[PDB]
Amino acid sequence: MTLEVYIDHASLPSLQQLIHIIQAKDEYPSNQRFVSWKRVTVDADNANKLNIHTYPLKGNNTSPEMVAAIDEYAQSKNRLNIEFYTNTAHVFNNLPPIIQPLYNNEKVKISHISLYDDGSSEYVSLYQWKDTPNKIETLEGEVSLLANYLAGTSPDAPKGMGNRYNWHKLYDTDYYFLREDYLDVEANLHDLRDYLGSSAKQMPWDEFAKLSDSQQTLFLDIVGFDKEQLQQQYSQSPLPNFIFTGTTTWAGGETKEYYAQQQVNVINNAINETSPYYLGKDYDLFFKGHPAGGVINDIILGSFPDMINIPAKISFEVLMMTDMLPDTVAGIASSLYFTIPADKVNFIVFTSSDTITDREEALKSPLVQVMLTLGIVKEKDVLFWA
Ligand SMILES: [Ca+2]
Ligand SMILES: [Ca+2]
């Protein structure tokens, strides 16, 4: 048999994975699927339809429940191929708890590994690492370290990049990149590009359209996106559509109400003809808040009578994948903006902290520098707050 294992706490690997599962259900009807997701929830209803067995996560990562169930499923069969699907930044947290106890089992084969970028996280890390002396050499030497670590013959694990981009050396592995081209534009990462070779791939955004109506309905049901509704709302007025992406409480420790008020002021500046925040022309107002915004989201909506809400618990990345991105998007910088077309990104804002205290320091943060390099925003479109 073949067992498919899915592990993710975030949004993007899960969505890409859900696409794959709906496809695979039809190509491999006899396959069994174990899924540990957090941001996306498969009910017993749709689980029965995709041959999914759900297990909880321990925090963000693989749980003993999933492990014990994979062991149980293994010792039964005469022979087992296992396919892993997970989040790239958390790969080292998720796969070894499963691979170690299974390693000496003559009957079990790890036959494929698919890794998907969380979001900005991977790119911030590559940025900080890209100027590290003898980096590819170092990786090459950490291969044995990962191999021995997985085999349980040594207590030492590779630190850093070696526990992340060495998987394709031991296993048939695809690294699915949010932005594969970053390896090409950043010349400091050309040698990593050579190191990964064909194992590095680019995430597609248009798979959803190639599913049947019935498969799209299921996809949308599982992720909880009333797509037809939003399509209707976009057209309630003929003016172009603007989504302001909200955040939850940041540095300072104020009453959550204070943080809603400030975002309301950003929205107010964003409409104003006279602000450097001005979007460009008249737009219809939409809002997708943080899933934990709670009373932040309520106040933001209570401030704009004609504004229309997009359900906060949705993974915002769903939009881009189902062609439901609006004309323009703006808000406080977050991982979301790594999956949005540059001319759909109007501007991003940065806050205050004891770490980032002026605009200059915000412009040199890894996060901004990467977005600049990838072409997502220009510096004038990066803005700083109090
Ligand atoms: Ca490639
Ligand atoms: Ca409209």
For the chain, the farthest-separated pair of C-alpha atoms sits apart, in whole angstroms, at 71
Residues sharing a CB contact under 8 Å with residue 260, sequence separation 6 or more, in sequence order:
295, 296, 297, 298, 299, 300
Tokens, residue 87? 């989040």
Phi, psi of 112 (to 5 degrees): -165, 150
Phi, psi of 132 (to 5 degrees): -90, 125
Centroid of ligand 2 to alpha carbon of 284 (angstroms): 5
| CA 217 remoteness from chain centre | 22
Centroid of ligand 1 to alpha carbon of 19 (angstroms): 20
Centroid of ligand 1 to alpha carbon of 203 (angstroms): 10
Q: Is 28 left (phi over 0), alpha (psi -120 to 50) or beta?
A: beta
> Any idea what DSSP says for residue 246?
P
3-state secondary structure 95-106: CHHHHHHHCCCC
Pairing of strands 382-384, 200-202: unpaired
d(CA 328, CA 240) in angstroms, rounded, equals 8
Q: Is 337 exposed, middle or buried (0-12, 13-18, 19+ CB in 10 A)?
A: buried
> Any idea what DSSP says for residue 350?
E
The residue written with tokens 């990462």 in the block is 189
Tokens, residue 11? 């949004």
d(CA 248, CA 244) in angstroms, rounded, equals 13
Q: What kind and span of H or E run contains 24?
A: helix 12-27
Centroid of ligand 2 to alpha carbon of 205 (angstroms): 24
Strand-by-strand arrangement of the 32-37 sheet: 52-54, 32-37, 2-8, 80-87, 108-116, 173-177, 200-202
Q: What kind and span of H or E run contains 360?
A: helix 359-363
- Residue 335 Cα distances to 90, 95, 329, angstroms: 16, 24, 13
The ligand minimizing its distance to the Cα of 196 is: 1
Q: What kind and span of H or E run contains 364?
A: none
d(CA 292, CA 248) in angstroms, rounded, equals 6
Centroid of ligand 2 to alpha carbon of 277 (angstroms): 20
Output the DSSP codes for 100-153. HHHTT-TTEEEEEEEEE--STHHHHHHHHHTT-TTHHHHHHHHHHHHHHHHHTS
User: Cα-atom radius of gyration of the chain, to the nearest Å?
Assistant: 22
> Any idea what DSSP says for residue 167?
H
Q: Do residues 7 and 114 lie in contact, with contact meaning Cβ atoms separated by under 8 Å?
A: no
d(CA 140, CA 143) in angstroms, rounded, equals 6
Domains and their CATH numbers in the chain? 1-211 (3.40.50.11120), 212-386 (3.40.50.11110)
The ligand minimizing its distance to the Cα of 327 is: 2
Centroid of ligand 2 to alpha carbon of 327 (angstroms): 9
The residue written with tokens 């050579």 in the block is 194
- Counting Cα atoms < 13 Å in the Cβ hemisphere of 130 gives 20
Angle at 306 between CA 301 and CA 307, to 5 degrees: 45
Total residues belonging to the chain? 386
Q: For residue 378, give the amino acid letter.
A: K
Binding-site residue positions for Ca(2+): 180, 200, 234, 237, 239, 241, 284
The ligand minimizing its distance to the Cα of 175 is: 1
Q: Is 260 exposed, middle or buried (0-12, 13-18, 19+ CB in 10 A)?
A: buried
Q: Do residues 204 and 247 lie in contact, with contact meaning Cβ atoms separated by under 8 Å?
A: no
Buried b (16+ CB within 10 A) or exposed e, 352-382: eeeebeeeeebeebebbebbeebebbeeebb
Angle at 223 between CA 29 and CA 241, to 5 degrees: 135
The ligand minimizing its distance to the Cα of 238 is: 2
d(CA 172, CA 90) in angstroms, rounded, equals 18
d(CA 282, CA 230) in angstroms, rounded, equals 19
How many helices (DSSP H) and strands (DSSP E) are in the chain? 17, 13
Tokens, residue 132? 């590290």
Q: Do residues 145 and 157 lie in contact, with contact meaning Cβ atoms separated by under 8 Å?
A: yes
